[PDB]
Design a protein around this nucleic acid. Structure first.
Lengths: 174, 67, 108, 170, 204
RNA sequence: AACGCGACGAUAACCCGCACGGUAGACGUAUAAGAAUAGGCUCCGGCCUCGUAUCCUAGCAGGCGAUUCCUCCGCCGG
């Protein structure tokens, strides 16, 4: 959903006399902005435990940037979505230079092949595939294969849309 | 060129193979350089070319009439 | 002999008025300037004088030529079309007729 | 004045609009070749002499090159071209004379009988022709030194097919 | 790039039907005169039989057609199949709409006024630029021929004659290309080479 | 097709009077290969993303006379 960023959101129960210094739960949340990152954080936390936004506070929101966004790597995303039938789990593989780019890849991919929106989709675990042969996926496998070199046939050239008429029939060999 | 080479390693192969010199020889760059020099023509230097192509065209026609 | 032209205007076409699906306002007209295709090129032609020249089949000053004058106010769309305001609105049957866009007032 | 105010016509209030000098664009310099776009000398290339007040520009042809005399023109009705000519030797005193506002500005038997007749074209004055020659004498001698400027200034500007003025560099 | 022409002639070969019709109808309303040649070489996407159902479907939803003006009349030539497309894209019940169709002029083959003139193409309606390589397409000539167009072999033989005249045109243009290139090389020795570098420094 | 079309045959003039010089839109309204798009062109050297190209384009809305050029354009005949 948009240019998402990663957010580290830490929060805990509002302290009472009975429980000073509460437990300080932390979650990693992909969101377009901070007010969505905090909303997803309370949505999950009320799902697992009894804490709510009204009785809870947020102690930090921090952006987790990519360590090496100029390196290309393979990502494994564990996933959970609610359909009309029910909830199912699957695992996709993506090839991007960053984790937020792979989550961007997932959200468009999941909405296309399965018609799942942001509310139904739950991130389980996104982890960099450190070593080859941990790639369990065919279309990534041909890409990680040795000495990849493919042609680009039938590339339609960029003709400007405001040049309605052309004098020469275009060539598709570039 | 090694795969995944960092910016220093590509720069080492760039200067060794001389990509800039080969690109200037490439006909794609000459069309670009012709296009940029054409676009920078002012109105007075446009009046040279109208006068100047006329002079060149005249030697073209007695040559064309000869053959 | 010169054997050259005398044109000092950019050619244009009167496309339509400012309109919705069904509510057309004749007080502003839409002009397609030849050669302009983005909003950036339309920004050059803003506030330039625009003339609509036609013939009337009667001489009043020794000539059957009548002119309606106007100006290019703002760009329209993303395709270089501009909005023009004239002293009187352009007729209606001039939809798809020639328009002379002058180069004055100039800031070049 | 003489009369008492015979009606209740109120005087206007004191307006707060002081006259300040006009700042021309940076492209207008003494010696810049200019392209006229309107008037009876449209399309003609001319040479600027002095920037006057309120957007008026004093400009000559010179007369022996194209045919445009000493004249005034408005800044917004002209296009400045990147070629600039030298004005070494041009009389600044004579230019300052022709830059004055008074320069270009100025019942009987014969009155009744010439009603309806078209007036005859009066010719050029002696001072107008003489001041023209004095200004241009050092001007075209400057124009001959730079190559192809004489045919440039005698020519007329026009637009061909594919000449897009938002892309033309002047 | 938004140039105004007197009349622009559009070659119809390898062009998709409705995309050419949408572009043409916008230019007619803008004030452009359009001439379309080779209407039998236009293309309609999808297989031939898909074109057959929508021909049978158009005749289905019209009880008591006029034999001369409409019904199966519109499909009986390729030129007026295209005219049916442009007419549905133009306000034909208005006088502006009627004026736009009088700027249009469509033909099968290339008539003698328009084989000596230049035939442009529309990139946004070309079949080979817009259709996927594996997708199947039909020709409007074979659509109208299986409806009742009678002059398919006629327009073919006049076209194979026109190629033969066009073959002689190139052979004359070949010789002009030799002589022009030779004259450029010949006069370059005496081209006053103070001025040859001046043209090169200006782009010519 | 009597309210579509083609070819061909035969075919309406002088005098007197008297009323006026359109077109849905010119302004350089210049530009003919064909064919393919998992290819093609050629001068046989080479060349193709790019028509962002080619031709034309100076002078009283474009004069006069020269110096100077046999280039370009136009009308009539074969």
């Amino acid at each position: 959903m948009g240019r998402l960023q990663e957010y580290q959101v830490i929060g805990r129960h509002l302290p009472t006399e009975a429980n000073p210094n509460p437990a300080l739960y932390r979650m990693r949340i992909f969101a377009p902005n901070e007010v969505v990152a905090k909303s997803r954080f309370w949505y999950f936390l009320r799902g697992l435990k009894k804490v709510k936004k009204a009785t809870g506070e947020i102690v930090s929101v921090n952006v987790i940037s990519e360590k090496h966004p100029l390196k290309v790597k393979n990502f494994g995303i564990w996933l959970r979505y609610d359909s009309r039938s029910g909830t199912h789990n699957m695992y996709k593989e993506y090839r991007e230079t960053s984790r937020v780019a792979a989550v961007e890849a997932m959200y468009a991919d999941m909405a296309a092949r399965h018609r799942a929106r942001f509310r139904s989709i739950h991130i389980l675990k996104v982890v960099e595939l450190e070593k080859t042969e941990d790639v369990k996926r065919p279309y990534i496998k041909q890409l990680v294969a040795k000495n990849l070199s493919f042609p680009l046939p039938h590339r339609v050239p960029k003709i400007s849309t405001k040049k309605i008429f052309s004098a020469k029939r275009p060539s598709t060999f570039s | 060129l090694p795969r995944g080479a960092r910016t220093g390693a590509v720069k080492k192969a760039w200067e060794a193979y001389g990509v800039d010199a080969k690109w200037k020889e490439t006909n794609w760059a000459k069309k670009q350089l012709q296009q940029e020099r054409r676009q920078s023509l002012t109105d007075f230097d446009r009046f040279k070319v109208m006068r100047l192509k006329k002079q060149r065209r005249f030697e073209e026609r007695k040559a064309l009439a000869k053959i | 002999p010169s054997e050259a032209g005398h044109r000092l205007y950019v050619k244009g076409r009167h496309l339509s008025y400012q309109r919705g699906r069904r509510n057309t306002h004749p007080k502003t007209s839409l002009i397609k300037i030849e050669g302009v295709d983005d909003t950036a090129a339309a920004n050059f032609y803003l506030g330039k004088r625009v003339a609509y020249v036609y013939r009337a089949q009667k001489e009043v000053r020794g000539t059957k030529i009548r002119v309606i004058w106007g100006k290019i106010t703002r760009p329209h769309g993303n395709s270089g079309v501009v909005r023009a305001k004239f002293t009187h609105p352009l007729p209606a049957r001039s939809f798809g007729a020639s328009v002379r866009i002058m180069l004055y007032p100039s800031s070049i | 004045q003489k009369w008492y105010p015979a009606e209740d016509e109120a005087q206007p209030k004191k307006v707060r609009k002081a006259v300040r000098p006009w700042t021309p664009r940076k492209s207008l310099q003494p010696g810049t070749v200019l392209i006229l776009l309107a008037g009876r000398f449209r399309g003609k290339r001319v040479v600027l002499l002095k920037c006057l007040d309120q957007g008026v520009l004093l400009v000559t042809g010179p007369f022996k090159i194209n045919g445009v005399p000493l004249r005034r023109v408005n800044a917004r009705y002209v296009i400045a071209t990147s070629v600039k000519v030298d004005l070494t030797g041009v009389d600044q005193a004579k230019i300052d004379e022709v830059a004055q506002p008074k320069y270009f500005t100025a019942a009987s038997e014969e009155a009744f009988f010439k009603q309806g007749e078209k007036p005859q074209k009066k010719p050029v004055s002696s001072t107008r022709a003489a001041d023209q020659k004095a200004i241009d004498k050092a001007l075209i001698a400057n124009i001959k030194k730079v190559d192809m400027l004489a045919s440039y200034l005698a020519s007329s500007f026009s637009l061909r097919k594919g000449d897009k003025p938002h892309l033309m560099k002047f | 790039m938004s140039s105004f022409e007197s009349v622009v002639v559009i070659d119809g070969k390898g062009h998709l039907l409705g995309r050419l019709a949408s572009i043409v109808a916008k230019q007619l309303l803008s004030g452009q005169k359009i001439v379309v040649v080779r209407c039998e070489a236009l293309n309609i996407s999808g297989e031939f039989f898909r074109a057959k159902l929508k021909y049978h479907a158009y005749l289905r939803k019209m009880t008591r057609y006029n034999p001369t003006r409409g019904g199966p009349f519109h499909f009986r030539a390729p030129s007026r199949i295209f005219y049916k497309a442009v007419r549905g894209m133009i306000p034909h019940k208005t006088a502006r709409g009627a004026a736009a169709l009088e700027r249009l002029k469509v033909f099968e083959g290339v008539p003698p006024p328009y084989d000596k003139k230049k035939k442009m193409v529309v990139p946004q309606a070309l079949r080979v630029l817009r259709l996927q390589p594996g997708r199947k397409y039909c020709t409007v000539g074979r659509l109208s021929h299986e409806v009742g167009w009678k002059y398919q072999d006629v327009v073919a033989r006049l076209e194979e004659r026109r190629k033969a005249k066009g073959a002689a045109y190139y052979e004359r243009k070949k010789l002009a290309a030799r002589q022009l290139s030779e004259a450029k090389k010949a006069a370059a020795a005496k081209v006053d080479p103070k001025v040859s570098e001046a043209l090169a420094a200006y782009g010519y």
